[PDB]
Design a binder for these strands. Structure first.
Ligand SMILES: [K+]
Length: 290
DNA sequence: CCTCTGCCTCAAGACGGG
DNA sequence: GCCCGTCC
DNA sequence: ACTTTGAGGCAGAG
């Protein structure tokens, strides 16, 4: 994520956030970070202090969450493509099992060379999907034209679906993508440190005036705002600006009919899900394809 | 105003019966 | 609708 | 990660 970026946009560029009804997204395609969704299911889907599992002790919380959340999206007319991270722990077995489930459900997935969010952003840039459905605002820093929050949130949570439009953010802040990347570094990114004493108000002001972190460092008073030693801001800038990403043209994205017979063998025979519940889910999925 | 830091509170997936 | 036990 | 974890809201110092 980017520390304080969503709050900043709401505070200073609220017109960049559009809130629309779920019905308005019927038929839209979205990219989703599979690795993060697996991680979240391992945390959320718990019983008695442990993940759901079959009698052999093999985890199934990830399968449970992926199976029903995907069906709910398709019931809303939203077609997801899942993006797996490239180069509580998400294991290779978790990924392989979720990929197997997705293939049997007829849901496309892709392997990112590196960051899943950056490859999600690349898919939106190429027009392959409408938006990245994520809470990670760094997807904007990777250049995603549209980010959508709370798309999969249950109705009970009463969280409105929010579209963040990158072009509007840049227009309101008066910045280009390169300057926006430097601003996100000053706000606080996973890749490198931020300058102590420089928060969201001063970072926006300094980026608008000086236009680059390099220029900012020269202008700043070293005594008042010392930078961290061996600051990797040039490296982080490059990771956001030119990330290693998949080729959106490489793989054709297709949503196909689920394979109920194989889903029963895998989810019920092996993973010991209730057959009644799996068949009910498959029927909802088939109905949503209409 | 602005940015910390420390203290605090509470959500964290989906389903289905009542 | 919500509450809350259960899912595996 | 619910016999825990962590993100965010708040108040006040500097
Ligand atoms: K800082």
């Amino acid at each position: 994520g980017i520390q304080g970026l969503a709050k900043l946009i709401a505070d200073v560029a609220p017109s960049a956030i559009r809130e629309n009804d779920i019905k308005s997204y019927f038929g839209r395609k979205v990219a989703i970070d599979a690795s993060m969704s697996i991680y979240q299911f391992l945390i959320a889907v718990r019983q008695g202090g442990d993940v759901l599992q079959n009698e052999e002790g093999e985890t199934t919380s990830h399968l449970m969450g992926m199976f029903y959340r995907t069906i709910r999206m398709m019931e809303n007319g939203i077609k997801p493509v899942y993006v797996f991270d490239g180069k509580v722990k998400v294991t290779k077995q978790h990924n392989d099992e979720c990929k197997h489930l997705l293939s049997l459900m007829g849901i496309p997935y892709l392997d990112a060379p590196s960051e899943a969010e950056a490859s999600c952003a690349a898919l939106v840039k190429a027009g392959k999907v409408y938006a990245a459905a994520t809470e990670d605002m760094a997807c904007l820093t990777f250049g995603s034209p549209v980010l959508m929050r709370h798309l999969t949130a249950s109705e009970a949570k009463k969280l409105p679906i929010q579209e963040f439009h990158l072009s509007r953010i840049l227009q309101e802040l008066g910045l280009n993508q390169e300057q926006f990347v430097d601003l996100c570094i000053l706000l606080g990114s996973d890749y490198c440190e931020s300058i102590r004493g420089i928060g969201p108000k001063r970072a926006v002001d300094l980026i608008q005036k000086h236009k680059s972190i390099e220029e900012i460092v020269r202008r700043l008073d070293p005594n008042k705002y010392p930078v961290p030693e061996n600051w990797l801001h040039k490296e982080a800038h490059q990771l956001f600006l030119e990330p290693e990403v998949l080729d959106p043209e490489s793989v054709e994205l297709k949503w196909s009919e689920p394979n109920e017979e194989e889903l029963i063998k895998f989810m019920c025979g092996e993973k010991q899900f209730s057959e009644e519940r799996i068949r009910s889910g498959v029927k909802r999925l088939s109905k949503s394809r209409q």
